[model samples]
Target: ASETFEFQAEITQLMSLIINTVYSNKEIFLRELISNASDALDKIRYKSLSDPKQLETEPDLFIRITPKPEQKVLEIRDSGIGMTKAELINSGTKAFMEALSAGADVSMIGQFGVGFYSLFLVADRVQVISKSNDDEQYIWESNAGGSFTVTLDEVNERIGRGTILRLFLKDDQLEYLEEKRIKEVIKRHSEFVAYPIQLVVTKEVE
Candidate 1:
């Protein structure tokens, strides 16, 4: 599907319950995303070892963070295998519900491939741009409300072959845009990620 459907009433209610009721702390979302990126890297790196062709196109195994203090935006770019439109919608919807039904909560839902939805709790607008090995690049955007939009990423030339999560942070939580906070979040829950987790940490010299 190239566009997002408005959630059914059942989904609306469930989303509210999960977003407002299930998750206790919003800060944990960063860890969940980082962990997901780590898994993606691990998958491709292992695949590349078996088929040297994988490296001919996709080679790097690292995570990157770009913070915009003025815009209160944080973009995490990854070089892992990307997704098709179906993967995006399913991961953004039904998969999460199944995870919830199985008694998974916010603290660990990322393990089930549903944690990406938690970005709604913190971001007013979110954009996901990705390119899978066998598919054209796709862009998905949402306002964290009842609907979202998915389209072809027409602007090419410098877009890479994986995923980039662009987040517009909530006004009150702008402090999280700092490099220190982002680094702390990565080092905590995502410490087990097999690939490099990086943030352009800023330091001062007195």
Candidate 2:
């Protein structure tokens, strides 16, 4: 089942600004997204520390990047504390635009809150698939135009536990589809990330 919602007028307008004006360095988007994933993993790990049961089933934590140049998609998946539907609504709506207008420190947005919008810099569309133990897996998708939709994932579409971000790169942003470019960016900005970041990339096999 899927529910469709329109972004508030403010969010629509501000998302445009965040997409067009906020970031001068487009590469920062990858850094911010990965840092957010790392933070999510940290939260789950901390929870498991006090309640060992939290780690009973899903103990391993990592982030995986799958680049689909043929499809013009870049996917980042992580095993971490996923968001509930309500949380997703708040995050995608109010919290996201507010963080931008509130003049929050751009550098710390990943760890603090409200940095996901950076994806709009290079992507024309983004689909977020997340599964939390507290809730069933759901997909949050948007074209960054004015509205977004949230829907329950199909039985087979579930992730064990975590979030996945699939970025549909814009025509001009095709460079992100390259494994070497992705590796370079990760090394340059996210090499120090606490979680293991793995790459599933394809090269001509000749």
Candidate 3:
């Protein structure tokens, strides 16, 4: 089943501020993603301590970054707690304009929510492929527009218990597809992340 949701009035304003004022640096997108991945891993680890069932399927915790320079795409995958249908919808639709309207500084963005929205700083489109132990895999896609679509992922059963973010880089953001650049950003921002960080890069050779 597939469903679509429109951004609330406040969310629309928040996104505008995000792109226009906040996240002016595009490289931070990788940092934001890795940070979120680390958080997800930590959350699951904590939960597993209380309920070992959570780690019965996949116990490993790590983050992988794959860059396809030719395709101008970057994918970040993690082995961590994934979202359910309700969470997928709620997270995408939740409003955050109340803080912006109350004169919240851009520097305070970290206090508001995950830096996921920073994806808009580099890509025109994004697809989130996620799977939770409690639910089947699903895909959420958007073009950074006022609406987004979610549907069951019938083809790929790639993730067992985690999330994969695919970013279609904008023309000027191709630098992100470079292996060295991504590694540089990761080292600079999330070098000491609790989970393992791996980079997968392929190049054509004569």
Candidate 4:
């Protein structure tokens, strides 16, 4: 079992910067996340070819985007190698810790490991639904404040692999739900992602 660890003071400042300074454009968040998912999927695919049984189940290598118009929610789901609890907390909460460990002047964003915080730019609430092939499914939800909630989603099906990120976008940022806008963003930033980035895109009628 992994122990819970607290972030260093430096981390808090970086988190604030991430929420305010680092991410200016909301569309970039989708591309950043898709890039991350692509990397994870690629890693898992390579590992699986050598040891198939290493994973108890087989989820395809792909990324999925689901937009809930009514709730103003957008889910970025991935069939990649999921995280352990240690990785969930440590990595999920890394922005602050990284800044502290690396010193205030240094950045661990793209060149290092804390890119996930990019989601904070436009999301009011962020939820991670993940099931490791080696462990049961778990849910991690946060308000992008300092605190977060971790739980087991009772309704979470056991038959799966991969992770699902359900994002509750700030109401004013609903423009990201449009297909054209999302496609443009994906093409601009994530055109090189190794896996297929599937979007539940909505189109106009002729």
User: What's the CA error at residue 93 for candidate 3, in Å?
Assistant: 11
Worst 10 residues of 1 by lDDT: 13-22
Ranking by TM-score: 3, 2, 4, 1
Q: Which sections of candidate 1 miss by over 4 Å?
A: 1-15, 18-24, 89-105, 201-206
Clashing pairs in 4: 11-96
Tell me, by TM-score, which candidate is best. Answer: 3
RMSD of 3: 3.0
Q: TM-scores of the models, in the given order?
A: 0.79, 0.85, 0.86, 0.80
* Per-model lDDT: 0.71, 0.80, 0.79, 0.70
lDDT of 1 by residue, 119-192 (tens): 76677777888877757788888775677678877873334567889889878668678877777777776756
Which residue pairs come into collision in candidate 2? none
Write candidate 4's Cα lDDT for 1-206 as tens digits.
22223445455555566566543456767767887788777767878899887555765678988787888988888888876555666643454454645564323354446667667767767878887766777777776565666776676555267788888987777877777777788888776777788889665698
Give per-residue lDDT, candidate 1, residue 92. 43
Worst 10 residues of 2 by lDDT: 105-114
- Which of 1 and 3 is the better model by lDDT? 3
